[PDB]
Design a binder for this molecule. Sequence first.
Ligand SMILES: N[C@@H](CCC(=O)O)C(=O)O
Ligand SMILES: N[C@@H](CCC(=O)O)C(=O)O
Ligand SMILES: N[C@@H](CCC(=O)O)C(=O)O
Lengths: 154, 156, 153
Amino acid sequence: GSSRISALEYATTRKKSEVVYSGVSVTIPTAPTNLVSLLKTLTPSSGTLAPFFDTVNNKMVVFNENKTLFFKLSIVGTWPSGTANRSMQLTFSGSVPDTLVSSRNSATTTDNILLATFFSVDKDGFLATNGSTLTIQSNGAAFTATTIKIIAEQ
Amino acid sequence: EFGSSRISALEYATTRKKSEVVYSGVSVTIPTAPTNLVSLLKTLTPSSGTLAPFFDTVNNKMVVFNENKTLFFKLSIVGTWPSGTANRSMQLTFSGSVPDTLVSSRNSATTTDNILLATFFSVDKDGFLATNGSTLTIQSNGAAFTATTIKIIAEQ
Amino acid sequence: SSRISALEYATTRKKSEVVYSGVSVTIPTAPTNLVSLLKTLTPSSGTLAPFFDTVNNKMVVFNENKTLFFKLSIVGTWPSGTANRSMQLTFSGSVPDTLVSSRNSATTTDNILLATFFSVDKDGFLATNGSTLTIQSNGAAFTATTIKIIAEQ
Ligand SMILES: N[C@@H](CCC(=O)O)C(=O)O
Ligand SMILES: N[C@@H](CCC(=O)O)C(=O)O
Ligand SMILES: N[C@@H](CCC(=O)O)C(=O)O
């Protein structure tokens, strides 16, 4: 069945946004900050925010499919020298909001960050209709990001 | 050949199976002692979703389909530790051939108490998870935690 | 016929899942090539091949537009009394990724679970170069007694 086969091929084709900002100086402040708003002003080194990051409404958006979305944010940067307790926090709005935190303390010298998660998108569900506002906040002190890689795939 | 049967099998293979359960507007203590998570949740009435088929409420464990398909797990908890709690963490252990221990730790720099634990389990046909399931044991560290919304997902 | 067989390939998981049991392995406080460390140990089950290259001491991937999922589960210990402590794992790449599992006095368990994914592109950086995995223990060295490592694609 060519039509059923084509549907299976579509279902098993990864769709994604994978955007790299190399050589930027993005301050991630200590106050809640819309992440897409922060990124959309920057010229990417590679990739595009579309289709998963909507630069008009400053949100992550998804395809209307019963297919899970995988998300990763990799940040190279620094907190100020001497900052001990510190964390990077990223919240996704949703029916139940999800709050990611990468915390560290005096024991860890590296300031680089890797946040990863997934969203089990339902057809005609909350994410499919509303998208998700991503709100980022640096805790302990402001963070200065010099490379950012952001991925959403479904 | 077996074309028809193989297409139907592929349709099954690419259909997500899931439990996605939300408990909204609750007030649930996650204590500092090890607590069977399924035992804790099954006392609550879901606002949406069902524990079946991934959470066995007789044996109080997560169970999986016997197929070479990875299971993705997420636990999202809205709640609080007592005011002033500085060092604190939420931990979740899954029994297995090698047990896995998830920890979300934080300190004075982070004021939010909300928790997001996510992972995967690479289920093998006739393997440990498929044969035994996994006991999930949750524990709050620093002080007891009071959860007001819980969302739990297992999918395969 | 062939589109069906191709779909069967596309939807079949490929994996390395290696368990090292009953070991007492120091993960030092200095950067350490993880594949170099593991390949000295005898697995209780599984094989480093095909995802872990023990000649160049790196993770390697299939040259396919298919995401790789990675998990490292470690049973072990920091020295008694260690409060602030963390385990970190860096993957080289076009942009390197640094995973950190940190904890403090509130947490008693020392066991570690690091999980992530890599959105491999055909003929992309990972497919062309692989990834060097560098592990480091912070606060004090960590003694690992069971290690389970998974890469799947
Ligand atoms: N099923 C929810 C997402 C659940 C999740 O947070 O993964 C939705 O479609 O909006
Ligand atoms: N392959 C193991 C699971 C490994 C993992 O922890 O992901 C099983 O089938 O029980
Ligand atoms: N697309 C990148 C991987 C991106 C990631 O780190 O997930 C590659 O093929 O090398």
